[PDB]
Design a protein around this ligand. Structure first.
Ligand SMILES: Nc1ncnc2c1ncn2[C@@H]1O[C@H](COP(=O)(O)OP(=O)(O)O)[C@@H](O)[C@H]1O
Ligand SMILES: Nc1ncnc2c1ncn2[C@@H]1O[C@H](COP(=O)(O)OP(=O)(O)O)[C@@H](O)[C@H]1O
Ligand SMILES: Nc1ncnc2c1ncn2[C@@H]1O[C@H](COP(=O)(O)OP(=O)(O)O)[C@@H](O)[C@H]1O
Ligand SMILES: [Mg+2]
Ligand SMILES: [Mg+2]
Ligand SMILES: [Mg+2]
Ligand SMILES: [Mg+2]
Lengths: 72, 77, 156, 46, 525, 104, 75, 106, 151
């Protein structure tokens, strides 16, 4: 969405996260010149992320468990 | 406000509404995450894996991810 | 160097996705007709004619497919029938799988020209590997010819 | 209101099945009509 | 008071009428739609189109050729019809340039729409465009370079032209192989311009790189039943006689006797006449006899007994190409054997190309006729390869006829536009604005070339503009990586005829569409 | 072998070649299917056996497992696999060079 | 996604359908076997009557649509 | 299983009698071989109830959380007095939240 | 895979969606059409329109006000609805400028169409326009002259 190449930028950020143990490195969407979300002041609630993951997983399971449709 | 007829689309709508109700933010992230999960599950099924096993693996990975989220969390005043 | 060129069309992507979906659907159609444990299909045309066949080319030709990508796969199977003689199911399955992979590749932001060149490179390497796996055969050895014919018939 | 040259393009490539299914019945009724018109008014007009 | 907007009605049912602003709107909309459709298939990175027919057969075509896209669509906008006919005539006159001329006309009309929105009389636009076209034509003519005298340099230019022509098409995968093939095929014509002398055979199956130019000729006909299937040092005789129930052309003649014995005698006489004709043919001392029309069972027998390969029913094109490749004379009378020249080739044999059998003429005498075997994986691939090869062969034949060449990749367009701008900022009035719009369209052409590749088109075109204004007259778009480069060094060359035709045709069509202020449609049938 | 080859490349080209190899991995999965075998484990075992050096290891439907197939007399001419690979790649490239559909 | 102009039956459905068709053709003539079997009477919807016990004749006179049933008829 | 025997003209009364006899024998065998503990131990009874609930739940979309829900269900049932009336176990459904977020209110 | 251009149909009968090209095209066409409608009624030499109601009474109305013209037309283009609401709100806030605001918005969107055609991300356009609006507003404020003290 920010115009950068998805796979290249994502791979670079992941490699940086692995190399230097900084889980704050993200996608510099606003082109501020740094990847450090801790420095860029990008903050999200832990409850929000946990709910996102939980709800997505449960709904994906519910959809995967359906194998029959009987529309009129 | 989307006028959908497919039942799975209604399920996505309800999932986004649930995320809105419980949290109020991130109602677009849940839908994209669910779509990605199902997209990967498609190629998983094409290789001959029972969808229940796929759901179990997803649940295990979700537990791992949630524990990691608790681990790397930061407290604020 | 900034954001880059803005892809303001998004219809070329839709066309590529539609073509890939059609090809993958055709391959999935002819997936159960492969191998010694494959099974035949019954095709009834616009008239009352009935065909039972395991031949991939015959299956693809007998059912009108109405989608340009599927029609190109039909011509692909016919061409493989002309040149090789058999393996007409395998070529369609391979093409479908390749385009299915192209889906995820295109979603990652790879231009559908780097994909084509990379596929050509992989094809050259694969031809080299297949030739390395080969074993020379002379026609005076009736046993190998019998084995080849039996293997060809194993799926019918 | 511009772009009158719509060039519907992909539209009737995915909705082709419905159009052909309805056109088959339309042509069936057309052939019935072409078989029964010459019975009608063709001599009754005189 | 207009015709349509008058209290009384002057028209039949279904006949309408569009006044100034509405007519201009419809014309510009249609032209811009045509240009937008045909573009994105331009330059080395242009993509193809799928032409799915709506007919009962539902023909499918995968093409990059602009003219085939434009002619094979249902068009109801009259200005779009103008552009379609322009593209078709461009294809008839020269091979390539169809997409370029269509896009140039569309851009010119878009600029004209903007100018009229700026309250400029269309006659002023037309005058400015005539001046601009004169300036651009003069600049391009002064920019041409001719290498006809230098043989090796001319061959190098031919190779570069073929490569540039094939760069956009599907054959760009094997550009080198196909460029060499097309150059050799055109050179084998020995200056003759008839592209019909080059036969392209499409054979499904096998890779696209498996295509090759035959060192002789290939015929898709059948030999007789009792005739040799392999002849060495063949002395071919090409003919266009009947050789099938050959009736005396006195159409009022009939056989009228009083006994079946006389009818038997007359049929024996007919058979004897056919035998005498075959004897006269054999008196030439031939090995192979190629006839345009059919050959019936009795002459087939007679040829078989004499050990003569009798190829039968090769159409006018077949006998013409055999005469070109072997040097024979297409003969219809055999009373003077000494006045008829016979074809000659080292070997004739039957070959397999896929699952079919074809007659192979190897070691031909003249060779001024080529057969190109095209192999592919789909019928659409074969058709598009044939179209692309036709584009290349047409351009190469034109270059052989007229050896003047200009540099492609936007160099010629942008030097034209530089000349137009130089003339534009020297004339007073709104003609200067019209001329600047002309130059803007000329710039827009390589801009679209760069957009199709995903490059920074604005920056690249600005760099090219600076380079051309500073005197570097051979700079152009280097599409290997996305910079500007020297077309002289990179070897990106175009036929001068193609670019001049593109410019003049686009100017003409934009002018004829621009002059319109009213579109009156009759009642459709 | 194509996965190994892609490990020696870089950039988007490596990802594309890896995808090519993964797509080639589908025929053994289809053969493992249709025969009642577990496709994932069967393909995994084939890949492991071929990595260990047994070029002739293949799916054995008679014994319901994986074994050398030259002892099963299952052979096919080279100009079947080679032709299928070349033609499929050509068709895929041709389809990839397409970005619009127009109805005549 | 397949987009074929027709109807497709896959798997157990078509197999059970074929068995249904074959069993129906069997039951058509099953009552006419052995010395205690009884003949059947056929009408050609114009008035023609054919009293018969021969299985081939019965199956030839009937007009059948399913392909597996046709296979048994020509058998 | 009895369809072929019907097809060959077997009288339905015989089949009915056979079903009744087999059912009686099977029910008697179930009652004979069923496992019960005559200790009435609270810990063992709770474990038995939890295991039965887990087996009952290990086929639904909440099978991944069958231990949690089984414990909740057993506690809810044991909190009922003597009739085990269903209407005394209210169930409230609130949209949003993970499955583990669900709770039992004492 | 687009919502509408997918083998499965995910909408009721009558619902439709327009992706990037089509959405931008319809929005720009609607905005430009509204701007071209309201203009030519601008400035001292502007002319007036006639609004013929299609109802039973068929009320007649000749007018020069931009808000009045935009209110009494049935616009189905949603971007046209946005511009009509903008003009109405402008009328509510202050009496004048109901034509100028619509013309300015239409011209801005036409320039945006050109910029999108020049392969510029719309977010870049939005950022540039925010900066331009800040600069223009500051300049206009600095140019303001006051005379309240002197009666
Ligand atoms: N006896 C066998 N055991 C294992 N694999 C076999 C045997 N016979 C054929 N195959 C495999 O089945 C595949 C598909 O062949 P087939 O089903 O005849 O259709 P096609 O030859 O058109 O692909 C071939 O790749 C071949 O390797
Ligand atoms: N290798 C190349 N580098 C730069 N430009 C090229 C190259 N090959 C072709 N072009 C340009 O692409 C334009 C379009 O050519 P093409 O699509 O082949 O035919 P048409 O002119 O009919 O569209 C030509 O004007 C040519 O200048
Ligand atoms: N006498 C005048 N001379 C020059 N410009 C004028 C004069 N009167 C009004 N204008 C200009 O006309 C513009 C538009 O005003 P008007 O036509 O009433 O439409 P609106 O005020 O609704 O936008 C204003 O910006 C104003 O500057
Ligand atoms: Mg948010
Ligand atoms: Mg086979
Ligand atoms: Mg060209
Ligand atoms: Mg005012």
């Amino acid at each position: 969405n920010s115009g950068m190449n998805p796979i290249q930028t994502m791979t670079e950020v992941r490699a940086r996260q692995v190399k230097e143990m900084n889980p704050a490195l993200g996608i510099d969407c606003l082109h501020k010149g740094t990847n450090d979300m801790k420095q860029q002041h990008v903050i999200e609630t832990l409850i929000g992320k946990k709910q996102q993951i939980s709800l997505a997983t449960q709904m994906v399971r519910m959809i995967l468990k359906i194998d029959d449709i009987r529309k009129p | 406000m989307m006028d959908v007829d497919h039942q799975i689309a209604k399920l996505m709508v309800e999932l986004s509404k649930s995320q809105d109700d419980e949290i109020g933010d991130g109602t677009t992230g849940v839908v994209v995450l669910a779509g990605a999960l199902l997209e990967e599950a498609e190629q998983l099924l094409d290789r001959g894996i029972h969808p229940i096993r796929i759901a179990d693996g997803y649940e295990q990975a979700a537990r791992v991810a949630i524990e990691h989220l608790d681990k790397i969390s930061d407290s604020v005043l | 160097r900034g954001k880059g060129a803005y892809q303001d069309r998004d219809k070329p992507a839709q066309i590529r996705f539609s073509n890939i979906s059609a090809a993958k659907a055709v391959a999935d159609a002819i997936r159960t007709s492969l191998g010694p444990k494959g099974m035949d299909k019954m095709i009834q045309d616009g008239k009352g004619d009935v065909t039972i066949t395991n031949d991939g080319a015959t299956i693809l030709k007998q059912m009108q497919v109405l989608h340009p990508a599927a029609r190109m796969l039909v011509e692909l199977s016919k061409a493989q029938d002309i040149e090789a003689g058999d393996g007409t199911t395998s070529v369609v399955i391979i093409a479908g799988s390749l385009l299915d992979s192209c889906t995820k590749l295109l979603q990652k932001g790879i231009h559908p020209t780097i994909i084509s060149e990379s596929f050509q490179k992989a094809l050259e390497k694969g031809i080299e590997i297949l030739t390395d796996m080969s074993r020379p055969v002379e026609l005076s050895d009736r046993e190998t010819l019998l084995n080849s014919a039996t293997t060809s018939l194993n799926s019918k | 209101l511009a772009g009158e040259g719509i060039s519907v393009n992909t539209g009737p490539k995915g909705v082709i099945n419905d159009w052909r299914r309805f056109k088959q019945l339309e042509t069936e009724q057309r052939e019935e009509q072409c078989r029964e018109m010459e019975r009608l008014i063709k001599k009754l007009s005189m | 008071a207009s015709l349509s907007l008058a209290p009384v009605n002057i028209f039949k049912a279904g006949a309408d009428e569009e006044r100034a602003e509405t007519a201009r709107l419809t014309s510009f909309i249609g032209a811009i739609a045509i240009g937008d459709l045909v573009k994105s298939t331009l330059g080395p990175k242009g993509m193809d189109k799928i032409l799915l027919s709506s007919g009962r057969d539902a023909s499918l075509m995968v093409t990059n050729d602009g003219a085939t896209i434009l002619k094979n669509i249902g068009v109801d906008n009259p200005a779009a019809k103008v552009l379609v006919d322009m593209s078709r005539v461009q294809d008839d006159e020269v091979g390539d340039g169809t997409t370029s001329v269509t896009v140039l006309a569309a851009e010119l009309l878009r600029e004209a729409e903007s100018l009229i929105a700026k309250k400029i009389h269309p006659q002023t636009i037309i005058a400015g465009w005539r001046e601009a076209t004169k300036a651009a034509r003069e600049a391009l003519l002064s920019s041409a370079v001719d290498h006809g005298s230098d043989e090796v340099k001319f061959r190098q230019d031919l190779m570069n032209i073929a490569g540039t022509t094939l760069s956009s098409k599907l054959l760009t995968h094997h550009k080198d192989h196909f460029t060499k093939l097309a150059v050799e095929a055109v050179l084998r014509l020995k200056g003759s311009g008839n592209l019909e002398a080059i036969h392209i055979i499409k054979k499904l199956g096998g890779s696209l790189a498996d295509s090759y130019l035959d060192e002789g000729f290939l015929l898709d006909k059948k030999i007789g039943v009792n005739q040799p299937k392999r002849i060495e040092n063949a002395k071919i005789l090409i003919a266009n006689t009947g050789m099938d129930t050959d009736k005396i052309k006195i159409f009022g003649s009939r056989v009228r006797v009083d006994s079946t014995a006389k009818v038997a005698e007359i049929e024996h006489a007919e058979k004897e006449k056919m035998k005498e004709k075959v004897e006269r043919i054999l008196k030439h001392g031939i090995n192979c006899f190629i006839n345009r029309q059919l050959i019936y069972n009795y002459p087939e027998q007679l040829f078989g007994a004499a050990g003569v390969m009798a190829i039968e029913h090769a159409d006018f094109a077949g006998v013409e190409r055999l005469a070109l490749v072997t040097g024979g004379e297409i003969a219809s009378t055999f009373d003077h054997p000494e006045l008829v020249k016979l074809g000659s080739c080292k070997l004739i044999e039957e070959v397999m190309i896929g699952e079919d059998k074809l007659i192979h003429f190897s070691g031909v005498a003249l060779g001024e006729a080529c057969t190109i075997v095209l192999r592919g994986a789909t019928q659409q691939i074969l058709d598009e390869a044939e179209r692309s090869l036709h584009d290349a062969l047409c351009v190469l034949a034109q270059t052989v006829k007229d050896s003047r060449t200009v540099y492609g990749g936007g160099c010629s367009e942008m030097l034209m536009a530089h000349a137009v701008t130089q003339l534009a900022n020297r004339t007073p009035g709104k003609e200067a604005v019209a001329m600047e719009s002309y130059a803007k369209a000329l710039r827009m052409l390589p801009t679209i070339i760069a957009d199709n590749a995903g490059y920074d088109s604005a920056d690249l075109v600005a760099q090219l503009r600076a380079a051309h204004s500073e005197g570097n007259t051979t700079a152009g778009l280097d599409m290997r990586e996305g910079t500007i480069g020297d077309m002289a060094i990179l070897g990106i060359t175009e036929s001068f005829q193609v670019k001049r035709q593109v410019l003049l045709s686009a100017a003409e069509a934009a002018e004829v569409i621009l002059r319109v202020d009213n579109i009156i449609k009759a009642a459709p049938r | 072998r194509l996965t190994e080859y892609s490990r020696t490349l870089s950039g988007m080209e490596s990802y594309c070649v890896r995808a090519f190899a993964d797509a080639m991995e589908v025929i053994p999965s289809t053969l493992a299917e249709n025969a009642g075998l577990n496709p994932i484990s069967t393909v995994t075992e084939l890949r492991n056996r071929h990595a260990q050096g047994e070029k002739t290891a293949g799916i054995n439907v008679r014994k319901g497992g994986i074994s050398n197939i030259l002892e099963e007399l299952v052979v096919q001419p080279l100009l079947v696999s080679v032709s299928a690979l070349t033609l499929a790649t050509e068709t895929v490239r041709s389809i990839l060079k397409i970005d619009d559909v127009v109805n005549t | 996604p397949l987009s074929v102009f027709g109807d497709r039956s896959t798997g157990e459905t078509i197999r059970s359908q074929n068995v249904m068709a074959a069993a129906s053709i069997a039951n058509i003539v099953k009552s006419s076997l052995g010395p205690v079997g009884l003949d059947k009477m056929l009408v050609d919807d114009i008035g023609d009557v054919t009293i018969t016990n021969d299985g081939a004749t019965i199956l030839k006179l009937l007009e059948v649509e399913h392909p597996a049933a046709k296979v048994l008829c020509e058998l | 299983q009895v369809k072929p025997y019907v097809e060959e003209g077997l009288h339905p009364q015989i089949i009915i009698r056979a079903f009744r006899t087999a059912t009686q024998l099977a029910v008697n065998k179930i009652k004979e071989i069923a496992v019960t503990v005559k200790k009435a131990d609270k810990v063992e009874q709770r474990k038995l109830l939890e295991k039965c609930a887990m087996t009952a739940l290990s086929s639904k979309l909440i099978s991944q959380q069958k231990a949690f829900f089984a414990k909740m269900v057993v506690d809810a049932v044991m909190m009922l007095d003597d009739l085990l009336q269903l209407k005394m176990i209210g169930i409230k459904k609130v949209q949003g939240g993970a499955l583990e977020d669900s709770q039992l209110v004492a």
